[PDB]
Amino acid sequence: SQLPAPQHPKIRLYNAEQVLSWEPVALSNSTRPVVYQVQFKYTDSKWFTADIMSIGVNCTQITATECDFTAASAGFPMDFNVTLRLRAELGALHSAWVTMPWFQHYRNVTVGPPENIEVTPGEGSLIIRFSSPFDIADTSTAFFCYYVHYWEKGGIQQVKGPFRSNSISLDNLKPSRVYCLQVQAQLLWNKIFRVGHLSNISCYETMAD
Ligand SMILES: *[C@@H]1O[C@H](CO)[C@@H](O)[C@H](O)[C@H]1NC(C)=O
Ligand SMILES: *[C@@H]1O[C@H](CO)[C@@H](O)[C@H](O)[C@H]1NC(C)=O
Ligand SMILES: *[C@@H]1O[C@H](CO)[C@@H](O)[C@H](O)[C@H]1NC(C)=O
């Protein structure tokens, strides 16, 4: 015998976040809570159970309707090919497995804006500093390139980049003028690029002297 399977499962891959979510399976009002089990496979490996010792988080017999793989070190290596599966359970009864499309985090990720954008005005310059959208420890596998879009109000937009640094100088600017700008990252991976979201517009006046 068989329970109904969870509907509309989704995988969120945003910056460093990895979260599987799904809609609850509700049986009769009188039934005790349904629980869920998540498993994962690396290409053609065994089906691993998503538990603290296999991936860093406990998504076995949970009542919650999500498995956040990076909530605690935890999570899938970003170049690993991963297939997730999910089911509902009530004791020894369970649903069929719902199997997700495979992903690789670098292939499938949505890249957010650089954060902590800090601008130090100079006489004819603005120095722009910011944090990467997320940390990539192995620099030889993947890296970010950055672009700054900037303009005077009502002017035509200019673009500087790409550059690898987390600091960039906009030079040869007019003194005592307001420049508005947005920073954007592009992720490069040697198997692919992802274009990141633009930061919010912020505006700075260059120094007089
Ligand atoms: C990822 O692995 C799946 C099988 O689990 C395979 O069908 C797919 O082609 C693989 N993707 C890549 C990019 O190797
Ligand atoms: C995993 O989390 C659930 C939710 O509290 C808990 O009941 C279950 O026994 C946990 N299993 C382990 C091995 O920690
Ligand atoms: C990841 O990207 C590839 C497109 O290159 C696609 O085949 C695959 O279905 C995507 N996976 C997910 C889970 O979005």
Author numbering: 28 to 99, 102 to 220, 223 to 240
From the paper:
Interferon-γ receptor 2 is a cell-surface receptor that is required for interferon-γ signalling and therefore plays a critical immunoregulatory role in innate and adaptive immunity against viral and also bacterial and protozoal infections. However, to activate this binary complex and activate the JAK/STAT signalization pathway, IFNγ receptor 2 must participate in a ternary complex created by a homodimer of IFNγ, two molecules of receptor 1 and molecule(s) of receptor 2. From its sequence similarity, IFNγ receptor 2 (also known as IFNγ receptor β chain or accessory factor 1, AF-1), has been classified as a member of the class 2 receptor family.
A crystal structure of the extracellular part of human interferon-γ receptor 2 (IFNγR2) was solved by molecular replacement at 1.8 Å resolution. The electron-density map was interpreted for amino-acid residues 28–240, apart from two short loops. The D1 domain is composed of three β-strands stacked on a layer of four β-strands, and the D2 domain is created by four β-strands arranged against four other β-strands; both domains are connected by a short linker (residues 134–143 in IFNγR2) comprising a short helix that is also found in IFNγR1, human tissue factor and other receptors. D1 contains a distinct structural motif of six stacked residues: Lys68, Trp74, Arg114, Trp126, Arg116 and His123. Analysis of the interaction energies in D1 revealed that the motif contributes significantly to the overall stability of the whole domain. IFNγR2 contains five cysteine residues, and our mass-spectrometric analysis identified disulfide bonds linking Cys86 to Cys94 and Cys209 to Cys234.
